[PDB]
Design a protein around this ligand. Structure first.
Ligand code: PLP
Ligand code: PLP
Ligand code: PLP
Ligand code: PLP
Lengths: 459, 458, 459, 458
């Protein structure tokens, strides 16, 4: 009854009684030959155990939970390539309907039924498309004026997210950075104007600054730019990087005027996979009207009577995230989105208030307007403490959390902060678990008799 | 009696509810919620009335993976790749996939961690290759005191549209080499005629979408070497191998098209085409670290692996990395070879059956990728009442998408039809398709009057 | 239209837009009222994220992987109560067949088709049943001889597992402990005999000592005990605690005489859920013959129909683990068990050898006979190191592992050691991941300028 | 043709294989392996020919949970509870379950973390309560200079077998108070007659398995208070509340049976009976920490919770802890009350329909747990050809298990039948049972000769 080939991968092989599971996974070259599907499944899957669990990843802004029905719907669409719009025209129209809904969430004045916007893989592509459109609009203007157009720049807070550095590098466009101070913890419009000139293609205020959790004041920026543009004729626009805030502000702060209600906001981008409540792979960019999307970048095709704009950096891509976005819009509606974001914001405020009660800590802001916030060590506490927030990050990782510590951008670079992001699926109960682990970690770190490596590096 | 039955309570039947008497939202988010079952049906039911992916014969992109790969990728739906500090095992796995691809392409780079990058498809992978070529050229010309404000690149008129996107989004001039019956792929002398001091690269294509053919990369490399020696322009190749990058290593290992060639400095591929992974995967590799400009890129060490950080996207699904690594382990070289062999053999089979039909003639007698094109015999077309556009419509009535289109410049009088054979399209399915084609021909030959497209051709 | 009850838990509620998920989980009192199944499911499930993943728990000996068919089979039996033998007689017979197979793996000479043994929830119950049986055989013996029987004792290594302390405390039986030394790293028979007297009910050698991974030499103990019993007439028996080794030795070391082949081995216990390859909830105890199981320990019940006779501490219990064990016996057979245990042992040997090459480390034993082993810091390295194995445990926890550090039992209590247990489902690829994390952790700890708290506590 | 088809290769059909022409192993492990599908069928197919759990009316143990509890528990199949350092959240969850149960029983303990312990069932929980009682008594008698080598405990003859196990495995004398028709539950004055200086506790039972009744704990408490005041023996109560512990708090909150009583120092319950969790759960609580001897127990601080480390088992499934905590949150007090109300109402319904049948008379008019027993009317039994054993056999022919058995001491001439109504046994299923009982009666009344069990009674 001996099975000659049991260790070699036949129908009787046990995965963990096989020769293949005594061998390392391939690092440099494809294996010469195959294995059983069960063996290969375990070899790939087992490597993903030893890292952060997504629901305990508190560094990320990107969705780690959807309900079972959205998840089934997206799984069922795993083999649907969005870009095959002639073959899958219902998904092309569904994409156009999502774009319409987003543009109207942002109060677009565009009268066309099919709003001018584009699907993206995240805010990276959406921001780049907005920035490229702004660059081409500026080039066209300056050429018509007989002015040089070879030295473009854009203006942004030092609180920028790295995709704006990617944009600057990949297109060779100069990024001008407005520093953060304790007195100006968000983009100050007067400071932004100091960096504007005839070569500025746009200013980029951020709704949901990743470093701080705050919102740049888009209305204040719009007012300053209106006076500046009237005086110079430079006609510098705004592109709003609303990666998180674009799905927070419409529901919880409808009266905050930050979007297409503003004269100079010509385009807005968002991460559908952050607070749009869809699994990874979704962003959106909208323009205020077709006249702000250059023809040099774009065309539109009619699918089943819908006019669908064709602009993007990617081509073939999963369609699942479109179904997921449209499901969330129908399943939740405005009320449902409001209640989910309310929960996330209330839990963030709850953690913020509990952090403030702890002896080592002080919050950077009293104002929690997105479901995330940052804190640092009280300066008097930090001076005689043996530990830093990097040490607290390490302690929390021992229980499976990722809670990141980092230094703030320019002029606040002496501030080591820690950030918590509250996403859908992070509950009050999970917040209580986190806070209990933070209190326990503090108590252990306060037993140290000698300074840690990062504490010594701060001297 | 349940007062709230139609309004969406726990007893509601989806299709006895008020919501399923209402249209789906076109312009604005609905004011309020519905039950998950109602929303699930409202979204899912809209996807019925379009092509079934396994019958989509226009696409090159994977429509089937086995149950284990599918389960593995489904389980990773909530993993954001870019969180590499949080998910360092996936970051390392990404690096191992890049190593394996670079070695499939015979990279001479000695570093254990090969210079390459994850992409969402060949679109991003091609654009990264082109931007790197543009920046390498800018730096060269700046050092020589030469202008660098008017870049161009050279490509066949058989280009795939991502190169037009690249041209538009970076404002780089695309110079196109036309196709003829005598030169059905990129001709090197004609390509060199379009090269000058401002050319950043030449782009041969392995798996031209319009024709199914391969540009001769080795022939281009030979021509570019003599031209670069004569001019000093130092023009490189970037190979767009969107399909061919996962065909040639297994079925044509001795064809010298990759990093074995002196001037091939970068190569891109669609992992979601013949890399056998569901939508959302491409790769770009450089021949060495010296060809990826520092201005574009940096690298971070995760668990001892050096992972290059270059890309157009940021947050993105990680599932396709697991899927690629699964295919590499599950199939190996032999398994990839056997799957691509099956796809190519079925393409050749259909190609041979098409040639036997009276209306048809194949564009090429040689099938080197699992796809091919044919057109109507000229004498048949002249007296026929129908065109290949009419055949496309007839086939769609049975659920197929088989596209008809005109070929690019100088061949634009040729209306062709294309079949792509992917994993999961079997000999049995090929027989169904061929049977539907014969029936469709038989119906179209009964027409007494020309169709609209037949009339538009006169 | 707006749903007035959306936050309160109706059919439209989103789990994470509900009032319930702004509230803590219940600590003291049952909630007054219900919630939706989806809310309750998340509230309980989400609390389990922030702890060790079972497949990365390298402290446990207990099975964390079975294949999909065993898992489905056991899931399908979740509502089957084993003890209802009149209602579920086929599972009762299946339990008996498992007992037969285990007794025959251990070379029972018992001729009855139905072997003398009992189901247990683990080695805890199995050991207690073996110990109670030894105690009752000894009481009856001493009563017949007109000798006292009120002060029983048993003899065991200080490497005992805590269930023997439970046995000592819950029955008020004296435990006599034989210390470990570097010269006698397992139970020395001569020293064990020195603790024996007329009140000793048994000696307990261990196959798979939890502290060390080693096997007590049962054959040496049997030989010494035979001479001791011939001299004293005390007739002290052996009960083998084979919690791990009972499913290793028969397959990988068939010629090692440790089981019912030995004259004085009257009972043996094992954890079916350790290297028996079944999910948690399984142990077995076998006796060499019916004459060694006292009649006082069998019981009969009639209130579940017909007549059910049993031996055990528990009563109602899941039956799933019986199905799982019988599946493994049929699915793997002798060859399959041998190949699975071979993989586990070979991977343990591989890690053991790589640990030995690292500058900080020295292995406790050169002999790896169970799929687990321990190491400690080289004494010369430890003296000048700023860190201890407790710090390495903490570093590994940051990547999801549990690799436990602890002090060895008596006379070796100055030795802080670390243990790795290799179970089915822990592959060579996972070993490489662990070893890479160990090397990285060593390199970080070697950067410390000051001693850690545990390093200071050692001086 | 596949040469190895019968031998177990990738093409083998389970029921076209050599292995399914062979017997399952009885004595020895098979020499070699088989495919998972064959092994799965070999084990699964043996479980068909026995009682379906939802038709098992003998058992008190849960046979139904909802789909979410079931999924949650299945997902925890590989979690070993005892690894509390590795799984500290489940350790804390266990402690919260103990808190909730202790508070359901009106514990006066002030500590946040109540003194209690997880068990596999009431067997382990009862044994822990008895051992604790035995050790408290040993310590007192030693301090008084009195003997402590001959312990005993007092219980009704309606005890469940675990108390016999406790008696035999610890060699502790069990003193039994018999049942009579005049004293259908434990009579306290009769219990006190068997108490002396060596009695470690008296064990009243809430949910007597034989009868379905509750011993009067408050009446016992009152009698013990006077006896302890007279003797100084200070004999305590341990309540075996295996079933009643999850019935009385919801349906009879004002019945004083628990830690509200002075002498009730510990209580045990089966979480897998009317705690509504699948097999593998019991709980024991003590009235305070001072009643759990240190010799049995220590406590460890996991994440700021005080968890007591006392038990007979060690490694064990953690799934049942999640199931218990899910039920507490999913149902709450109201949900438990409504579920137990349903079970009790259905038991009362069956009880009333049984009483209307000519052959039958109920043992008690009072149904306080969701179960009851009946027997044959004495005048009917005398001229009947059949017994309740014959009715058990007839009902088994339709898949039911409804057990017939003789009652304990002094009622051992009474053959009775028991029905237990658990969650998942509805009014509709009760109607099916009652229809089968009536059909069985009509068939048995056609007998012309006595059955073997009927002859055995005369
Ligand atoms: C997330 C983020 C980005 C990047 O968006 P992705 O969705 O990760 O591509 C850009 N800007 C801000 C403010 C962000 O938070
Ligand atoms: C598919 C294709 C592309 C575009 O690649 P995507 O994977 O769809 O982004 C580019 N070039 C060629 C030759 C292609 O076939
Ligand atoms: C596992 C272990 C025990 C405890 O057995 P469980 O299966 O956890 O109940 C007892 N003795 C030894 C040697 C062990 O390894
Ligand atoms: C069921 C029962 C027991 C045994 O409990 P298990 O949960 O089966 O271990 C003990 N006493 C009573 C009163 C019971 O009903």
């Amino acid at each position: 009854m001996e099975d000659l080939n049991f260790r070699k991968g036949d129908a009787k092989t046990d995965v963990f009684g096989s020769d293949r599971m005594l061998q390392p996974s391939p690092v440099e070259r494809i294996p010469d030959g195959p294995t059983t599907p069960e063996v290969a499944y375990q070899m790939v899957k087992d490597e993903t155990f030893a890292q952060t669990q997504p629901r305990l990843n508190l560094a990320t802004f990107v969705t780690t939970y959807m309900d079972d029905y959205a998840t089934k719907l997206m799984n069922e669409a795993i083999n649907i390539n969005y870009i095959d719009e002639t073959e899958y025209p219902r998904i092309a129209v569904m994409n156009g309907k999502c774009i319409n809904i987003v543009a109207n969430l942002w109060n677009s004045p565009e009268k066309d039924t099919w709003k001018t916007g584009a699907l993206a893989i995240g805010s990276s592509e959406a921001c780049m498309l907005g920035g490229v459109a702004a660059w081409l609009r500026w080039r066209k203007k300056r050429q018509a004026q007989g002015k040089p157009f070879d030295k473009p720049n854009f203006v942004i807070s030092t609180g920028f997210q790295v995709v704006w550095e990617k944009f600057a590098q990949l297109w060779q466009i100069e990024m001008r950075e407005v520093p953060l101070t304790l007195e100006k913890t968000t983009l100050d419009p007067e400071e932004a104007l100091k960096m504007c000139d005839e070569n500025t293609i746009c200013v980029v205020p951020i709704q949901g600054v990743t470093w701080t959790g705050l919102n740049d004041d888009v209305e204040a920026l719009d007012k300053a730019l209106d006076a500046y543009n009237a005086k110079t004729g430079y006609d510098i626009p705004i592109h709003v990087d609303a990666a998180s805030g674009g799905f927070i502000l419409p529901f919880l702060y409808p009266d905050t005027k930050w979007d297409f209600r503003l004269k100079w906001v010509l385009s807005i981008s968002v991460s559908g996979h952050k607070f749009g409540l869809v699994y990874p792979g979704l962003g959106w960019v909208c323009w205020k009207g077709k006249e702000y999307l250059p023809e040099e970048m774009s065309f539109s095709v009619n699918y089943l009577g819908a006019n669908i704009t064709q602009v993007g950096l990617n081509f073939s891509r999963p369609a699942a995230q479109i179904l997921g976005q449209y499901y969330q819009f129908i399943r939740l509606g405005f009320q449902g989105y409001k209640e989910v974001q309310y929960n996330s914001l209330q839990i963030a405020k709850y953690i913020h208030g509990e952090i403030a009660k702890m002896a080592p800590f002080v919050n950077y802001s009293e104002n929690v307007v997105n479901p995330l916030f940052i804190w640092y060590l009280k300066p008097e506490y930090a001076k005689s403490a043996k530990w830093t927030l990097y040490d607290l990050q390490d302690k929390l990782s021992q229980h499976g959390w990722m809670v990141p510590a980092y230094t703030l951008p320019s002029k606040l670079e002496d501030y080591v902060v820690m950030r918590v992001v509250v996403r859908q699926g992070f509950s009050r109960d999970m917040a209580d678990m986190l806070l209990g682990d933070i209190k326990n970690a503090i108590a252990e770190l306060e037993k140290l008799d000698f300074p840690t490596p990062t504490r010594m590096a701060q001297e």
